[PDB]
Amino acid sequence: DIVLTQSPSSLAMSVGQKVTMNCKSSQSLLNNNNQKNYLAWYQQKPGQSPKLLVYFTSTRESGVPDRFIGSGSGTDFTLTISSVQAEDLALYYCQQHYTIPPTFGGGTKLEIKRADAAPTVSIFPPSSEQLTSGGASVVCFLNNFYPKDINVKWKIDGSERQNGVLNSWTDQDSKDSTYSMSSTLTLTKDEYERHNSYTCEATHKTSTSPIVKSFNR
Amino acid sequence: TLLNGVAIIVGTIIGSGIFVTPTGVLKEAGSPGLALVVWAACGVFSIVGALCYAELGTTISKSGGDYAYMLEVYGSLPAFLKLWIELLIIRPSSQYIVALVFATYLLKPLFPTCPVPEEAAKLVACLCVLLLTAVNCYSVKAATRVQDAFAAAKLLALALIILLGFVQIGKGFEGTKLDVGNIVLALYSGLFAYGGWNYLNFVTEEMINPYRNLPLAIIISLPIVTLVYVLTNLAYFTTLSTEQMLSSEAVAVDFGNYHLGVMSWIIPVFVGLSCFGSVNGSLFTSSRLFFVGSREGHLPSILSMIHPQLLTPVPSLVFTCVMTLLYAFSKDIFSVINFFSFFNWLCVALAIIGMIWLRHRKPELERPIKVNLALPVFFILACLFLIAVSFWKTPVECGIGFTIILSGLPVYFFGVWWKNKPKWLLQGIFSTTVLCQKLMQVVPQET
Amino acid sequence: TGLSKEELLKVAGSPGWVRTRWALLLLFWLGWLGMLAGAVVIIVRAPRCRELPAQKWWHTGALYRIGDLQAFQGHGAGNLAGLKGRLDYLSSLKVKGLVLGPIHKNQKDDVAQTDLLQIDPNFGSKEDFDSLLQSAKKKSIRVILDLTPNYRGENSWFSTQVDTVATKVKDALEFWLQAGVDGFQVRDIENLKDASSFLAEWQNITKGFSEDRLLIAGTNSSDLQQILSLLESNKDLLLTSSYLSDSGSTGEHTKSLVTQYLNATGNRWCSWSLSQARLLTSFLPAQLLRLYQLMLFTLPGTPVFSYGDEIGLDAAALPGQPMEAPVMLWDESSFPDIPGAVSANMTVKGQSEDPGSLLSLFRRLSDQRSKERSLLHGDFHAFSAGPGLFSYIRHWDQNERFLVVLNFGDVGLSAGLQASDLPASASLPAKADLLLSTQPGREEGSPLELERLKLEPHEGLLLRFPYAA
Amino acid sequence: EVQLQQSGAELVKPGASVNLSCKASGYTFTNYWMHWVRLRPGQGLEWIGEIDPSDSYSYYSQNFKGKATLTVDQSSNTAYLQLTSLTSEDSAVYYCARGRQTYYPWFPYWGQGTLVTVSAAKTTPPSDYPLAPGSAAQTNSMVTLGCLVKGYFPEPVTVTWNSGSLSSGVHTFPAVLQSDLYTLSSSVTVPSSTWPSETVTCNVAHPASSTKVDKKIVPR
Numbered sequence A: 001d002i003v004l005t006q007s008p009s010s011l012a013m014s015v016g017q018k019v020t021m022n023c024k025s026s027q028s029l030l031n032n033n034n035q036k037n038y039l040a041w042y043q044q045k046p047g048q049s050p051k052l053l054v055y056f057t058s059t060r061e062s063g064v065p066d067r068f069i070g071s072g073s074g075t076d077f078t079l080t081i082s083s084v085q086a087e088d089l090a091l092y093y094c095q096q097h098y099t100i101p102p103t104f105g106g107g108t109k110l111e112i113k114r115a116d117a118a119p120t121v122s123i124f125p126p127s128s129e130q131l132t133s134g135g136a137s138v139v140c141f142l143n144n145f146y147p148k149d150i151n152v153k154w155k156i157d158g159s160e161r162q163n164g165v166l167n168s169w170t171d172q173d174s175k176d177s178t179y180s181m182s183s184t185l186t187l188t189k190d191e192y193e194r195h196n197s198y199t200c201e202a203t204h205k206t207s208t209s210p211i212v213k214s215f216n217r
Numbered sequence B: 001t002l003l004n005g006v007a008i009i010v011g012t013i014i015g016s017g018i019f020v021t022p023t024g025v026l027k028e029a030g031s032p033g034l035a036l037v038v039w040a041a042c043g044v045f046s047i048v049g050a051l052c053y054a055e056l057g058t059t060i061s062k063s064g065g066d067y068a069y070m071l072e073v074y075g076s077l078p079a080f081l082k083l084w085i086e087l088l089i090i091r092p093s094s095q096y097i098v099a100l101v102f103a104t105y106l107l108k109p110l111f112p113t114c115p116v117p118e119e120a121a122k123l124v125a126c127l128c129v130l131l132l133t134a135v136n137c138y139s140v141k142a143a144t145r146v147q148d149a150f151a152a153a154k155l156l157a158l159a160l161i162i163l164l165g166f167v168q169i170g171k172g173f174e175g176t177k178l179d180v181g182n183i184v185l186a187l188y189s190g191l192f193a194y195g196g197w198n199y200l201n202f203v204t205e206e207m208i209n210p211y212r213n214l215p216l217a218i219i220i221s222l223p224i225v226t227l228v229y230v231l232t233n234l235a236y237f238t239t240l241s242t243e244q245m246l247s248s249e250a251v252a253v254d255f256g257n258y259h260l261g262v263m264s265w266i267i268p269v270f271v272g273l274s275c276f277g278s279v280n281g282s283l284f285t286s287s288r289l290f291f292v293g294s295r296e297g298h299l300p301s302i303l304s305m306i307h308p309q310l311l312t313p314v315p316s317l318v319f320t321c322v323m324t325l326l327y328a329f330s331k332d333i334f335s336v337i338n339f340f341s342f343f344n345w346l347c348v349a350l351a352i353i354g355m356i357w358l359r360h361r362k363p364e365l366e367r368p369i370k371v372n373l374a375l376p377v378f379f380i381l382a383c384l385f386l387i388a389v390s391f392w393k394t395p396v397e398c399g400i401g402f403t404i405i406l407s408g409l410p411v412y413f414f415g416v417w418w419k420n421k422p423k424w425l426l427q428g429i430f431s432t433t434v435l436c437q438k439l440m441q442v443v444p445q446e447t
Numbered sequence C: 001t002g003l004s005k006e007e008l009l010k011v012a013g014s015p016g017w018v019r020t021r022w023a024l025l026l027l028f029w030l031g032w033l034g035m036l037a038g039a040v041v042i043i044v045r046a047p048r049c050r051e052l053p054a055q056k057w058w059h060t061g062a063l064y065r066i067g068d069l070q071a072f073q074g075h076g077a078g079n080l081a082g083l084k085g086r087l088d089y090l091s092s093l094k095v096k097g098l099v100l101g102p103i104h105k106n107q108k109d110d111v112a113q114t115d116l117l118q119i120d121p122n123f124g125s126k127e128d129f130d131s132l133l134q135s136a137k138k139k140s141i142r143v144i145l146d147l148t149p150n151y152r153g154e155n156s157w158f159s160t161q162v163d164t165v166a167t168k169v170k171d172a173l174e175f176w177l178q179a180g181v182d183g184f185q186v187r188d189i190e191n192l193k194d195a196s197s198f199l200a201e202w203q204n205i206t207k208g209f210s211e212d213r214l215l216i217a218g219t220n221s222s223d224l225q226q227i228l229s230l231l232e233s234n235k236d237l238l239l240t241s242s243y244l245s246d247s248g249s250t251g252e253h254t255k256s257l258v259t260q261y262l263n264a265t266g267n268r269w270c271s272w273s274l275s276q277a278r279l280l281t282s283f284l285p286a287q288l289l290r291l292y293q294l295m296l297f298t299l300p301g302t303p304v305f306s307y308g309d310e311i312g313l314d315a316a317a318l319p320g321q322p323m324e325a326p327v328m329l330w331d332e333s334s335f336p337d338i339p340g341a342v343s344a345n346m347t348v349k350g351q352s353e354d355p356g357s358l359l360s361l362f363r364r365l366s367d368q369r370s371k372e373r374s375l376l377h378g379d380f381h382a383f384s385a386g387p388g389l390f391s392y393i394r395h396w397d398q399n400e401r402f403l404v405v406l407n408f409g410d411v412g413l414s415a416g417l418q419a420s421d422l423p424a425s426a427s428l429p430a431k432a433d434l435l436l437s438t439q440p441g442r443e444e445g446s447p448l449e450l451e452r453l454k455l456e457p458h459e460g461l462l463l464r465f466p467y468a469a
Numbered sequence D: 001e002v003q004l005q006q007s008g009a010e011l012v013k014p015g016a017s018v019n020l021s022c023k024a025s026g027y028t029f030t031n032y033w034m035h036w037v038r039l040r041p042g043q044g045l046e047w048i049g050e051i052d053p054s055d056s057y058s059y060y061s062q063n064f065k066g067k068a069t070l071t072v073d074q075s076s077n078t079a080y081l082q083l084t085s086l087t088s089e090d091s092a093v094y095y096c097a098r099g100r101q102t103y104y105p106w107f108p109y110w111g112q113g114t115l116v117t118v119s120a121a122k123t124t125p126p127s128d129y130p131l132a133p134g135s136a137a138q139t140n141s142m143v144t145l146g147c148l149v150k151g152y153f154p155e156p157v158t159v160t161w162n163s164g165s166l167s168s169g170v171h172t173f174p175a176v177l178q179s180d181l182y183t184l185s186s187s188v189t190v191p192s193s194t195w196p197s198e199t200v201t202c203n204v205a206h207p208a209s210s211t212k213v214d215k216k217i218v219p220r
């Protein structure tokens, strides 16, 4: 089969700027008889299906904004976005259609750069219903920050906790280009009973000092 | 007289291979023009071969064929390896090939278009070899009459093809392959039809008296054979397409089906009978080698023996026969022709090399015929050319054949050279021998 | 050595060895009659050969039409004695046939001054015609003559008094058969009133002369039903038509046009052709010309080409010349009216040398269709081998079997043949010998793995494979 | 409109077969071939094969030949991909796609994917636990609310707030897998006037065990 190398794997760029994906095929996809080049680009936004952008290297599909320009021939092919919008963060895949079965690139993750912002930090005491289970889960939400890099300290009556802590980041929000992150600590009921004061504190590159939230049961 | 000598040698050389091998040379030469040139080249090679055998057949003169010469030139192991090759490769494979052409032609009118079923061709080949083994065991007085008759059918079928070819012209080319590899397999296929001269050519010296007249019988006769072979191929090429002649295992039946209308009762019958004659001939004339090979002490004593009420050499026939019947395990007729040809020409190489080494080692040994050295020094190289190409053009056939040759070295040591002394072994050999003697009712010949 | 005669004559004690040797001698004849019975069983239960159909000469390979003697030659040499010169080319094409576009004395739209029997003297004399026709016989090219009456006019049968025109033909066929032509073409039969009846009469006249002569009708039609109606009453008529012409212009319809027509006619004889007169390149775009020549040489039936199909001649490529009759390009001289416009690769001379050329494909295929019993009159089984592919096997009872694989769609396949639902008699092998491809860069002669084969866009393949019992 | 749709989720015990199904609408179903494409996590799209609804011929990539099996049902415009011998590394999302031209492979129309998880661990309905700020909640102008979803299986659980009405300012964090059960949490922010005054619910929904639950976020 044909193989399509794609690069770069990540392309972090700022709103308004021009950007370029490269796709590189292990054979030519020019059809000599017809003088067009068989390639397509699909955008796949987080949590949705692939959408076709261009095919035969350049032909925009209907319902595609005219900022997507595809170009190239032979084996060097490029999808370019003339002026990136916040709505454009996605993985982009190139596909050949010069043979069936077709084959695809491993895809370029476009990411957005914005002015850095500190997290809104909130902490939630365990749900009174959950306390029936013999366990309890304490949850700390860090909302609407940039960039992605962050860390969290859990403190419990002042003692630092590093067992049974979990984290999950959102994909970057297409309206505002911010990340958000959830942090979770799970306890037995008797482990939540024996200690009084629970603290979540978050260190992010926008502040020297950590941001703090806490509660006393 | 010389004119009646030629009528003995031409009828000896013409054989049955001419009904197999047109398809063989055409498959390898690609297109008719080069096939006719190969037929001529095989003629010319046979002229050079025959005159070298006119020399060996009058200088050494010992009876029994090539083995009788090997006893003088080499003795010992190489003499046994000639006998072993000739009884396990050459005389079996050339019988099976002619028994199988018999079978395909006898069957082909039941299968006019589609190829005749191999499982039936091989049974009918075997039914022919067994029936003619039984007839040679029951009566030399009968099997001689069976040889006397069908020599007529050989020439009748072959002349009929030519006269039909002439009326085809009366009413009425490129050489598309040229690989040295293939042209050696074309030469093997074409040379097979001439393959009589190394066995029997000396017979004519018992009726053509002057030693210089034996070369004249050769030099007149082998152009006559070459003419007949070229004319029969022209009879096919003026009637049939290349794309027909490569499709049919029995090409003269295709030609007979075109011209005759009465086709079933003519070419299948007359060619069939010629091959029934040629299988019979190869059985009848086999005994000579067993008698000689056991008299000169290379071959087990039982294979000398004869059934005294009928004077027929029963254990030699039954061994000949069962070797022929094992070639039913081979795949394809041109596989076996390649196999036969390799060892046949490798044996002729050892003979003619031998003749020059003997002319060097023992000069002026009273030779009634002495050919110009310029003939053998081309001919030896021609034998080597065929062999040397064939090692790599057809490896697997040579591999199993050299496996047969190397399996001769144990039985040479055990049977002849080491002379293993244990009395239990000798009584076992004796017990095995008398069992066969009692079970076939056979006795030694008069020493 | 061993036990001697003088001992053995008393060791043969009758209760042992004599009874034993009787038993073995009977066992041999019992066993050999066993092997005779074995062989006779095999010969009785082995499958018998299908009989060959008796094939008319036009089954045995391509016809070839010469609509204007002048345009095929260049002027001055545009006469029948000129044509007598060219048959060595035609013999190179292996064309079992010829069709000389009308040579009779026609005056444009004049019913009375037109004769179908006297030749138009521009082309020579009957003494030339016979000289040609005898040469063609000598070289195994049968010759058909085209008798369509008003061939210099607009409407080929004239507008009026059609029964007099049919009467001209009825007389003409007899004369020219007596002169020794092998058959007749007539054209434009949609412009002939009561067409089917006149074809029936003329066919009767022709076959009533001899069984080895034919009438090739031809119509401008592309309607399957109209065609099937002309072929209903007449059963050994070749009827060329525009039916395959409307191909979809990336081949897409062809699998279906072809297999509907075979099905509808009930697998009788056919004549495949993109038209009654015009060139392949009048209809095909030039990427398909190789692909259609691979197909026209391998469907059941007698293919028909116009002159220069074998070189991909095109009326448009050298402007000004009529689409009726483009000048055939033998060598770079051949169209001197705009010198330097002819490239070498456009000409017979320029192709004849090159194994990649169109004419090297035509010559090669023409061989196969005229020699191989399977292409000559085998059965035909289409099957679904792949997304674009029109794919089908030609076979006959036990001879070589030929699989054709035409990739009509513009996208290559990358994952083999993957045959659904082959007839159980005709199953595909694991591997098969590439006899030729429409494209360069293939290992011709070599066996291919059908489950891992790779067709390029528009690559057609001809694979050859042996039988299985 | 052209619209392909598919079931949301399937669980498969290793080695077993599965049927994934794709119902077309909005076009003449026999005119266009149907393709199946898969997306292994973090490893790029891969195309299985395609099927022609007009005669059930189907053509497959070398990697799937005999492992997959496409059929079709012209009476409902449905295409079906059977998959067989499924290993853990055949866990993926499977997408049904339609061509533009009749069988040529570029894919303007895709169904929303069927998430196929291959695991011996059993289906486990979710436990939902609402999160409210507690102390000093109303001291700020905007207030965050949350919904922990715990110990559920398989992967796809959906959250929307107030039946999709609060589609603005929602963050739902990817699921974390623990002891062969998933954990996920969802969050929303509203005016401090709204939350004690109005209904707020996480409308948690789980395709693979049919449970739908609307926990109200009540103050401590």
Ligand SMILES: *[C@@H]1O[C@H](CO)[C@@H](O)[C@H](O)[C@H]1NC(C)=O
Binding pocket: C204, C207
């Ligand atoms: C036409 O020929 C057929 C025989 O092929 C015959 O039955 C029929 O009567 C003929 N009719 C005429 C009018 O010649």
Ligand SMILES: *[C@@H]1O[C@H](CO)[C@@H](O)[C@H](O)[C@H]1NC(C)=O
Binding pocket: C190, C191, C220, C221
């Ligand atoms: C065929 O002939 C008919 C009748 O004259 C005419 O109406 C029609 O347009 C023609 N079609 C073509 C393709 O020549």
Ligand SMILES: *[C@@H]1O[C@H](CO)[C@@H](O)[C@H](O)[C@H]1NC(C)=O
Binding pocket: C263, C264
């Ligand atoms: C055409 O082919 C189909 C194939 O199933 C067959 O059923 C039908 O009888 C054939 N003939 C006609 C005239 O439709």
Ligand SMILES: *[C@@H]1O[C@H](CO)[C@@H](O)[C@H](O)[C@H]1NC(C)=O
Binding pocket: C343, C345, C346
């Ligand atoms: C023939 O050669 C010319 C000149 O190089 C080239 O432009 C053209 O594409 C070739 N093919 C044909 C059919 O003209």
